Paper text:
The GH5 arabinoxylanase (CtXyl5A) derived from Clostridium thermocellum displays an absolute requirement for xylans that contain Araf side chains. In this enzyme, the key specificity determinant is the Araf appended to O3 of the Xylp bound in the active site (−1 subsite). The dockerin domain recruits the enzyme into the cellulosome, a multienzyme plant cell wall degrading complex presented on the surface of C. thermocellum.
To understand the structural basis for the biochemical properties of CtXyl5A, the crystal structure of the enzyme with ligands that occupy the substrate binding cleft and the critical −2* subsite were sought. The data presented in Fig. 3A show the structure of the CtXyl5A derivative CtGH5-CtCBM6 in complex with arabinose bound in the −2* pocket. Interestingly, the bound arabinose was in the pyranose conformation rather than in its furanose form found in arabinoxylans. O1 was facing toward the active site −1 subsite, indicative of the bound arabinose being in the right orientation to be linked to the xylan backbone via an α-1,3 linkage. As discussed on below, the axial O4 of the Arap did not interact with the −2* subsite, suggesting that the pocket might be capable of binding a xylose molecule. Analysis of the three structures showed that O1, O2, O3, and the endocyclic oxygen occupied identical positions in the Arap, Araf, and Xylp ligands bound in the −2* subsite and thus made identical interactions with the pocket. O1 makes a polar contact with Nδ2 of Asn139, O2 is within hydrogen bonding distance with Oδ1 of Asn139 and the backbone N of Asn135, and O3 interacts with the N of Gly136 and Oϵ2 of Glu68. Although O4 of Arap does not make a direct interaction with the enzyme, O4 and O5 of Xylp and Araf, respectively, form hydrogen bonds with Oϵ1 of Glu68. Finally Tyr92 makes apolar parallel interactions with the pyranose or furanose rings of the three sugars. The mutants E68A, Y92A, and N139A were all inactive, demonstrating the importance of the interactions of these residues with the substrate and reinforcing the critical role the −2* subsite plays in the activity of the enzyme.
Residue numbers in the entry: 35 to 283, 290 to 516
Write the structure that this text describes.
């Protein structure tokens, strides 16, 4: 290259999503040129510092009355869209361009959409960083668009016609199809498959076509659980997909983000690039960065060092899910070994006063001090604990409410800890019992009130003088 401009994103090896020119998912917030100036260069640039490598653009809002007299034709925002294209080009960002809806979400004007893409598909065909998303939420509110009673009918015909237009003028540009508002359950995937089959027959001559440069765009409005199921089922069917709009409503949907990361699916979140948008500002910590930081969510960003490289130790890299009760028994393990703190390093997933593990056991190349334990069950304990040290464990709380939090501890004298969950203090100062020896073990328990979701459990040592074997958490 002779600039930071990114190369064409392509379907990944696993055929789950589009990845960039380094094999990594596209991740990004949104902006709009539907009625405003292009977001300024400096604000677009900031997305790189938030771990993103892509921008979702709602380029123009369709006119429901087109082509009637006084209706607004596509192309009116060209000078603003050109600015977003150039800015993302120079910044080394991907750009996903779509048609927005304004007051008409779950609807479309077919002629307007065809005319939009006749203009814009050739215009950006040669911009390797740019992807085309046919039309935002064109049907109320999800699949099957191909049903005769879809509201409105005929959206698959629009998808087909627009696809033909795009591919005529922009033969190598990634195309994202459907943009389903509500994509949920095994049923949602099955209905989407009817749409896919119909589109495929019309465009490729075979209901079961293997896409080379297309994916299903979908939104998160079925909710994280049902959306995850629909995505899993579609992926099993052999069709890649791409998250193009979702929110926790109100801020990043941490749970859906986690699942998309797990599944290998690119995502565009519904928080905006300053100065303006119709939802929440992605640069305000409370709607994005704090949610990421508190949850323990991590990915490898294209630029910078945020989010920090980190993850769960053991448990197959999955967040440790809390157990529940059925009648009088526990459905899964409640015990998190102290020595199984998140990887990431000193100042990231733990803080240790010395970079060496002086105990030399279990994780000899990290800074936490670990020795063999003679407590019931064997294994290891964290030792050489001093004031200001801390340890983090990424967990996933299944249900909100009261939990018994237990620490398995040993100490010659008294000691003090405090425990945070998602960077919220749940214990205050917790005085720990002197047991009279560093391998004389007791279980200390305090009741805590937890919110549901992915969250870091952080143990803060307010003093030294204790060893820690394990942590247990169970609903009351
Ligand atoms: O379709 C709209 C678009 O016009 C913009 O307001 C972003 O939100 C979407 O729901
Ligand atoms: O944690 C203690 C450490 O402080 C040192 O006293 C050696 O024994 C360990 O168990
Ligand atoms: Ca150490
Ligand atoms: Ca230590
Ligand atoms: Ca242990």
């Amino acid at each position: 290259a002779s600039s930071p401009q990114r190369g064409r994103p392509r379907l990944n090896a696993a055929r789950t999503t589009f990845v960039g020119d380094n094999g990594q998912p596209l991740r990004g917030p949104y902006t709009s040129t539907e009625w405003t100036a292009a977001a300024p260069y400096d604000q677009i640039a900031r997305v790189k510092e938030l771990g993103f490598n892509a921008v979702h653009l709602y380029a123009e809002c369709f006119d429901p009355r087109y082509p009637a007299p006084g209706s607004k034709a596509p192309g009116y925002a060209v000078n603003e869209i050109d600015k977003i294209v150039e800015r993302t080009r120079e910044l080394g960002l991907y750009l996903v361009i779509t048609i927005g809806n304004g007051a008409n979400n779950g609807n479309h004007n077919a002629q307007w959409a065809r005319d939009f893409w006749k203009f814009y598909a050739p215009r950006y065909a040669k911009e390797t960083h740019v992807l085309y998303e046919i039309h935002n939420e064109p049907v109320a509110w999800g699949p099957p668009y191909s049903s005769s009673t879809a509201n409105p009918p005929g959206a698959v015909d629009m998808e087909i016609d627009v696809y033909r237009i795009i591919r005529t003028y922009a033969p190598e540009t990634p195309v994202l199809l459907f943009s389903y508002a509500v994509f949920g359950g095994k049923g949602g995937a099955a209905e989407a498959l009817k749409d896919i089959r119909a589109f495929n027959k019309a465009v490729f001559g075979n209901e079961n076509a293997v896409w080379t440069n297309e994916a299903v765009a979908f939104h998160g409005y079925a909710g994280w659980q049902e959306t995850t199921i629909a995505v899993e089922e579609l992926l099993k069917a052999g069709y890649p997909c791409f998250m193009t709009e979702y929110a926790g409503g109100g801020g990043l949907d941490v749970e859906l983000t986690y699942e998309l990361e797990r599944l290998g699916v690119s995502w565009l979140t519904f928080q905006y690039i300053p100065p303006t948008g119709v939802s929440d500002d992605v640069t305000k910590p409370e709607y994005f960065s704090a949610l990421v930081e508190n949850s323990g969510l991590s990915w490898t960003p294209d630029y910078g060092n945020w989010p920090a490289a980190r993850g769960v130790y053991g448990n197959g890299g999955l967040a440790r899910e809390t157990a529940t009760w059925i009648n009088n028994f526990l459905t899964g393990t409640t015990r998190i070994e102290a020595e199984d703190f998140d990887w990431g390093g000193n100042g990231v997933s733990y803080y240790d006063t010395d970079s060496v593990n002086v105990g030399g056991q279990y994780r000899p190349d990290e800074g936490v001090d670990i020795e063999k334990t003679s407590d019931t069950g064997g294994g290891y304990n964290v030792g050489w604990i001093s004031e200001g040290e801390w340890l983090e464990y990424t967990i996933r709380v299944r249900n909100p409410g009261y939990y018994n939090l237990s620490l398995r501890v040993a100490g010659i004298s008294g000691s003090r800890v405090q425990v945070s969950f998602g960077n919220q203090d749940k214990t205050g100062v917790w005085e720990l019992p002197a047991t009279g020896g560093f391998q004389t073990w007791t279980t200390a328990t305090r009741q805590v009130f937890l919110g549901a979701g992915l969250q870091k459990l952080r143990i803060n040592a307010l003093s030294g003088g204790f060893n820690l074997n394990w942590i247990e958490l169970s609903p009351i």
